Inverse folding.
């Protein structure tokens, strides 16, 4: 990449949630291997982010690579309308088998946000078929479910700046963010949620939440009793429960799916990010026979969704290979060990002036700060320390690949601790 | 693939818009090469669909394969937050250069529907930054823009069964489907509906959104380019943004590189997908102007509020770059031109078949509209038996073959379409 290439990127290429009028530096990556990113200048960076949760097996993984190359040899893509193929069948077999018993109907899609849209549409079509006027979603504050309009409608109104779209977005119900920490349970936590359920139980199509960990909305970690209660309340009212595990799925919190922490099964389950081992985009929305059949037995005669690249063979083959790595079970002790190291090595941030809170769960470590980070200055600091840590707002957090070496993890936690010692990298 | 595999698929795997309780047969594909799909049992089928527009270079294309494997060796994926990479830069360079001058800012995304959502959000954020209360979209009937909530809100309400979501989806403005044909003459009467809507709602419209020249999923309709010219000028005069959804028409399918070229206009926002990657995997792009991109970033949010996890995926960008590189030769122009003449000539006889209502052809798109709905299971079986993969829908038997299709292969497709419509055997 020439200097001109970098200049072109700056002035012509949009990046996630960042200014085009005051663009901040971006770092040119040429390749990646193991748990490292390689910059164009040759510098190697230990990846603390897993490219946002997804790359649970690191980069240039020989098994993932071989499975992708082999599927390219057969066919990278063929349409899914009137056609099926081995990669999709093998993936759906794995997803059905590894998720709770009732979850046995799979709708593959292209991205997490679309998987949520699909889940929301399922709930709406389900009640339409049952002849019930139910179009409200009940969710938690500080939630994040994606960027498309339907998904946006259940994201935190404050965090997601709903004022920007006031009048275009359907108005859903927002219960208080769960207070009880992943910590003791306080029954008073439930009041707000109960109030909404009582006033709107006739109207609610589904409850949608991120189980245990609220990711993009604040990296919050709450008590599993909440899920137990939400499942019971949904059962009692006959309301559908959507669990968005696009960030928590596939081992990240220490259990295969975060719903396990409460031993509950949702009616609809959304999966993404780490589904493919972070090689390329793919998502899946699973639901029950009751939901899927009911929908097909309504006026539309089918579930009304079907993206062009639905069931893409290449992505399915990558997901199959990623799941085959998880099948070994090594991730269990890998995450447990990561959790121990995160707890131990982030503990000192609790003596730092710029820290508001420290919390760890599985392969997730979060240092919440008192003031917003200086994105440009802090990003450069991390790069100079030989690490790729991507903070945002008042969060400096780590979600490394499960295969990260202890010495690599140590470089990450050491950098985080150093960054929070004084105000240098803040505001 | 075993029969047990096929039973599992039927019982547990949803497919695009089709019943789970009364599913029709799906055919098991094991591989594909050139212009052929290879079924589990060994049967080879000439692909007439390009896997829904996308596979313009066919299957197992050497250049696409080589580029994809080479990128895998470097990195299949890395996040785009605070990071950039060569595949993304090369792709965006190509996209900026090949599209109209004002379209110089690129937002890469995951799918066509997401690209439309991005376009709609850009329009909404643009006006919010300018302090104007504009939240409505003016679109056309028979339009199709995707299946996510925002996209659904501008899709044809009858075709898409908006009654299912009545009260949840926002209610946009729907001008009548364009009547004047791409084959035929312009009729100024075509404008009254649109003119009446713009006049009544000019002050609240954030954007006009349309598929240029060809309305795909909504009816395989082919309309007169004067429409785009007229719309562009109206948008210009009114200060309203124009969104051209070229997810199906982009990259040469209608005979021009982008269907907007037929009218020699440029939209404010351009959506691309399907053939972007040569149909190897999903990727999309939404291009806009500097005016739009800067205005949004200067508003309250300080940025355009979107950013999907897999944004800028190196592997898909590498595939797209290789696909665009093939198009750079310009060979597609002649290929598409030749396909167009053969489609016109070989579908023409169908106009005399009793089951046929209309025959229309544009670029590498050939449509035979019938008088009655097709019998999906029976007709699909028939096509497979003729050694062709043609996927009909409703009253439409259409072809959109890969540009590399051989004349003999194209003839097998047209022969099959003609034979399918000779009597009512496969209808209703
Ligand atoms: Na299951
Ligand atoms: Na351009």
């Amino acid at each position: 990449m020439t200097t001109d290439d970098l200049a072109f990127d700056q002035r012509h290429i949009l990046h996630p949630y960042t200014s085009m009028t005051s663009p901040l530096p971006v770092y040119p990556v040429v390749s990646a291997e193991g748990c490292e990113l390689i910059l164009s200048d040759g510098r190697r960076l230990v990846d603390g982010m897993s490219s946002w949760w997804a790359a649970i097996h690191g980069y240039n993984h020989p098994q993932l690579n071989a499975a992708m190359k082999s599927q390219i040899d057969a066919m990278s893509h063929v349409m899914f309308g009137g056609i099926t193929h081995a990669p999709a069948i093998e993936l759906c077999r794995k997803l059905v088998a590894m998720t709770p018993q009732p979850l046995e109907c799979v709708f593959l899609a292209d991205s997490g946000s679309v998987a949520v849209e699909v889940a929301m549409k399922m709930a709406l079509q389900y009640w339409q078929a049952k002849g019930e006027a139910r179009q409200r979603f009940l969710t938690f504050r500080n939630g994040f479910h994606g960027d498309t309009f339907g998904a946006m409608s259940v994201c935190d109104p404050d965090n997601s700046m709903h004022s920007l779209w006031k009048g275009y977005l359907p108005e859903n119900l927002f219960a208080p963010a769960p207070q009880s920490r992943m910590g003791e349970w306080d029954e008073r936590d439930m009041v707000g949620f109960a109030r909404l359920m009582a006033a709107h139980r006739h109207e609610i199509a589904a409850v949608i939440i991120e189980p245990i960990v609220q990711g993009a909305g604040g990296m919050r970690m709450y008590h599993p009793e909440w899920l137990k209660r939400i499942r019971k309340i949904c059962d009692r009212e006959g309301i559908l429960l959507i669990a968005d595990e696009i960030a928590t799925g596939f081992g990240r919190t220490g259990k295969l799916f975060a719903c396990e922490h409460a031993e509950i099964a949702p009616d609809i389950l959304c999966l993404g990010k780490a589904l493919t081992g972070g090689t390329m985009t793919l998502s899946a929305t699973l639901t029950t026979r009751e939901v899927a059949e009911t929908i097909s037995n309504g006026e539309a005669g089918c579930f009304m969704h079907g993206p062009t690249f639905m069931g893409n063979p290449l992505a399915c083959a990558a997901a199959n290979a990623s799941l085959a790595i998880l099948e070994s079970g090594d991730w269990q002790q890998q995450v447990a060990d990561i959790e121990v190291q995160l707890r131990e090595q982030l503990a000192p941030a609790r003596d730092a002036e710029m820290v508001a809170d420290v919390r760890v769960l599985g392969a997730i470590g979060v240092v919440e700060t008192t003031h917003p980070v200086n994105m440009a200055a802090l990003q450069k600091f991390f790069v100079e320390q030989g690490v790729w840590i991507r903070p945002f707002g008042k969060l400096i957090y780590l979600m490394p690949p499960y295969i990260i070496l202890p010495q690599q993890l140590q470089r990450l936690t050491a950098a985080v601790n150093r960054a929070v010692q004084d105000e240098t990298f803040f505001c």
Notes: Residues 112-130 of chain B form the longest helix (19 residues). The pocket of sodium ion (ligand 1) is lined by residues A 96, 99-101, 103-104 (CB under 6 Å).
